């Protein structure tokens, strides 16, 4: 039941990216082609975040 946590703050930059805070929880829907970006949902919204900035809880 695939819940995750943010390892660092990430400030939204480009096209359909989402801001996240260190230690907040999110839900993963998927990945991009090469797998460096992850599409996620939080209490603020939905959007792209770096794959390297998150981990399971």
Swiss-Prot record:
Widely expressed. It is found in: Cytoplasm, Cytoskeleton; Nucleus; Mitochondrion. Phosphorylation at Tyr-8 by members of the SRC family of kinases disrupts SH3 domain-based autoinhibitory interactions and intermolecular associations, such as that with ABI1, and also enhances kinase activity. It comes from the Eukaryota. Residues 1-57 form the SH3 domain. The modification Phosphotyrosine is found at residues 8, 53. Interacts with SORBS1 following insulin stimulation. Found in a trimolecular complex containing CDK5 and CABLES1. Interacts with CABLES1 and PSTPIP1. Interacts with ZDHHC16, ITGB1 and HCK. Interacts with STX17; probably phosphorylates STX17. Interacts with INPPL1/SHIP2. Interacts with ABI1, ABI2, BCR, CRK, FGR, FYN, HCK, LYN, PSMA7 RAD9A, RAD51, RAD52, TP73 and WASF3. Non-receptor tyrosine-protein kinase that plays a role in many key processes linked to cell growth and survival such as cytoskeleton remodeling in response to extracellular stimuli, cell motility and adhesion, receptor endocytosis, autophagy, DNA damage response and apoptosis. Coordinates actin remodeling through tyrosine phosphorylation of proteins controlling cytoskeleton dynamics like WASF3 (involved in branch formation); ANXA1 (involved in membrane anchoring); DBN1, DBNL, CTTN, RAPH1 and ENAH (involved in signaling); or MAPT and PXN (microtubule-binding proteins). Belongs to the protein kinase superfamily. Tyr protein kinase family. ABL subfamily. It is linked to Leukemia, chronic myeloid: A clonal myeloproliferative disorder of a pluripotent stem cell with a specific cytogenetic abnormality, the Philadelphia chromosome (Ph), involving myeloid, erythroid, megakaryocytic, B-lymphoid, and sometimes T-lymphoid cells, but not marrow fibroblasts. This is Tyrosine-protein kinase ABL1. It comes from Homo sapiens.
């Amino acid at each position: 039941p695939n819940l995750f946590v943010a390892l660092y703050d990430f400030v939204a930059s480009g096209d359909n990216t989402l801001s996240i805070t260190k230690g907040e929880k999110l839900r993963v829907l998927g990945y991009n082609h090469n797998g460096e970006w992850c599409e996620a949902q939080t209490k603020n919204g939905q959007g792209w975040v770096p794959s390297a900035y998150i981990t399971p809880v």
